[PDB]
Structure formats: C-alpha cells, structure tokens
Amino acid sequence: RYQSYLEGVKYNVDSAIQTITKIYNTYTLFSTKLTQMYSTRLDNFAKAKAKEEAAKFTKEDLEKNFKTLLNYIQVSVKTAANFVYINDTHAKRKLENIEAEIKTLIAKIKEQSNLYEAYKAIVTSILLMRDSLKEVQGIID
C-alpha cells in the first residue's frame, strides 16, 4: 500500500533522471556538430555532413523531452503527496520545488528562437536538477 507509493515515486524519479541525461546527451551531440561544421581539420564533404546533422536537431524534440521530464515529476509529486513520515515528506518537498523549476525552464525555452541558445539556457539547471533527484532517491530508499 504505502510501499507502492514509494515504488511509484522511485520509478518516476529514475525515469526523470534518465530523461535529463537524454537531454544533456542531445546537447553534447548538437555541440559537436556545430564544432565540426566550422572545423579547419575536416574536408568539405565531412563539414557538409555535419552542417546537415546540426540542422536536424529540433526545438520540438527538446520540448517533447521537457514535457516527458515534467510529466514524470508531476506523477512523482502526486504520488508523494501521500507520504506521511519525516524523511519522505522532505522528498515530496524537494520534488515540488523541482516541478516548479521545470516549468520555469520550459518557459525559458519558449523565449529563445535559437535552438542552441535554448539548450544553453537550461543545461546548468538540468544538471543540478539531476543531482537533486539523485538525493531524492537516497532520502526514500
């Protein structure tokens, strides 16, 4: 009963952590394509392929990943609202703080026309958020 709440929060927090890693790995890959397409060491064929690849990253994909992240945390918060003990109510409080931050990041992404700039606006925040979510996992398990 109460165990299924703890299990549900653990699953959704783990999925949120994975989603952040997916977003950060996308940023890393995007960055390398932008570097490659202006590189002086690469030939024209290779730079052209890198320019094509840099153009295939979408704001839609970033926004989808952020909606996936928000949804995992929102389920975590709804489930954690059933927590009653001193340590797991603290986990619930951290998750609500993280939910609010995710909404702020989704708003920041909207106000950036340039996709790389949108990633740059959120990378520090999501890296810190992943660490905070790792703390949450320890607080309850």
Automatic annotation (TrEMBL):
Coiled coil location: none
Protein origin, superkingdom: Bacteria
Protein name (database record): Fibronectin-binding protein BBK32
Originating species: Borreliella burgdorferi (strain ATCC 35210 / DSM 4680 / CIP 102532 / B31)
Taxonomic path: Bacteria, Pseudomonadati, Spirochaetota, Spirochaetia, Spirochaetales
